[PDB]
From a paper:
PfRh5 is a member of the PfRh family and binds specifically to the receptor basigin on the human erythrocyte surface. Antibodies to PfRh5 can block merozoite invasion, suggesting that it is a potential vaccine candidate.
We determined the N-terminal amino acid sequence by mass spectrometry and re-expressed this region in insect cells to produce a highly stable module of PfRh5 that we denote PfRh5-C. The shape of PfRh5-C approximates an elliptical disk, the core consisting of nine mostly anti-parallel α-helices that encase a small β-hairpin located near the N-terminus. Helices α4, α5, α6, and α7 assemble as a triplet-helical coiled-coil domain running the length of the long axis of the molecule. Electron density for residues 258–293 is absent, indicating partial disorder of this loop within the crystal structure. A search using DALI indicates that the PfRh5 fold is novel. Comparison of the Rh5 structure in the bound and unbound state shows that there are no changes in the core structure on binding of receptor.
Author numbering: 146 to 257, 294 to 513
Write the structure that this text describes.
């Protein structure tokens, strides 16, 4: 009858975050899955740390969690060839020609809200290649559910074995111990970070780079690197929107966990009340952990793209400096 975390009644494809921490690398996270696996991970430690006599069960729990991690990562690796095929296409869209020869002032008018015909051809491939990856993840859904259910069944079995000296006044040492050893470190790590300042700095990058794009678009327009910038800028906007979503959660859950933990330690509860509060803390930690994990990787992706974006603008420094209504080689 207890409120246990269930598998989403949502349409999977809408809850996937794509990460690109460095060049030549792409990965994905099915958000509900990560939250679900993390939820039951906390439920498992809370169940074995309740009684001072079951602390020794941690190695078995650690082994099982590591197994689930391997098994889950094995299913997601079934989409590797197809994911690698997407990476090759992104490589083409982001690097249409080499911009590394500083002793080369070459204007690529020869190639051919996008305009460039050759970029538009590479873009349609990207749309198909991306759509295929989502279909591959959607096609392996049941295999992902099977693993999620095995983690659910394990956590729930441990939780059913939780027992008190007197059901009228159950102890909360498990909640205290687990927090202190598994959660508290993460809370302090978040609290040492200025997440809102990170958002301000990203907002400025996006708005300032948009002005540089507006300038280039007016002078060049049809140039392949203009579409490349339009492509990187749009990706950076989605990335930022995701960081903003996760930051809101991180900030909320930091306050809630700190407040809720104070209401739960160094006191007793009737068994029923104890179990409901373990399920509720597990929910707060899973949501907080999922978002800090994603935020960190999305932050890395944003700056990986920004570094390239900055290199393209530096490559087009001559046109950026050029006078209003003055234009470089016009193309057709
Ligand atoms: C599960 O996730 C990753 C898999 O690479 C790993 O770094 C992490 O330590 C694993 N968690 C546990 C508790 O084994």
């Amino acid at each position: 009858q207890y409120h246990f975390k269930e598998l989403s009644n949502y349409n999977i494809a809408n809850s996937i975050d794509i990460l690109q921490e460095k060049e030549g690398h792409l990965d994905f996270v099915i958000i509900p899955h990560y939250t679900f696996l993390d939820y039951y991970k906390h439920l498992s430690y809370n169940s074995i740390y309740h009684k001072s006599s079951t602390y020794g069960k941690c190695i078995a729990v650690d082994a099982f969690i590591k197994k689930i991690n391997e098994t889950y990562d094995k299913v997601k690796s079934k989409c590797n060839d197809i994911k690698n095929d997407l990476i090759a296409t992104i490589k083409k869209l982001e690097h249409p020609y080499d911009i590394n020869n500083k002793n080369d002032d070459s204007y690529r008018y020869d190639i051919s809200d996008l305009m460039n015909r050759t970029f538009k051809k590479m873009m349609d491939e990207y749309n198909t290649k991306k759509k295929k990856l989502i279909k591959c993840i959607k096609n392996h859904e049941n295999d992902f559910n099977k693993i999620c259910m095995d983690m659910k069944n394990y956590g729930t079995n441990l939780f059913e074995q939780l027992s008190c000296y007197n059901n009228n006044f159950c102890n909360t040492n498990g909640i205290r111990y687990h927090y202190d050893e598994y959660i508290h470190k993460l809370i302090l790590s978040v609290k040492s970070k200025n997440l809102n300042k990170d958002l301000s700095d990203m907002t400025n990058i996006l708005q300032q780079s948009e002005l540089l794009l507006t300038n280039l678009n007016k002078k060049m327009g049809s140039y392949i690197y203009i579409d490349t910038i339009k492509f990187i800028h749009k990706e950076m906007k989605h990335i930022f929107n995701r960081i903003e979503y996760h930051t809101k959660i991180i900030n909320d859950k930091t306050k809630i966990i700190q407040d809720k933990i104070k209401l739960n330690i160094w006191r007793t509860f009737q068994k029923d009340e104890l179990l409901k509060r373990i399920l509720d803390m597990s929910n707060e930690y899973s949501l907080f952990i999922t978002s800090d994990h994603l935020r960190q990787m999305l932050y890395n992706t944003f700056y990986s793209k920004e570094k390239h974006l900055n290199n393209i603008f530096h490559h087009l420094i001559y046109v950026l400096q050029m006078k209003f209504n003055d234009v470089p080689i016009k193309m057709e």
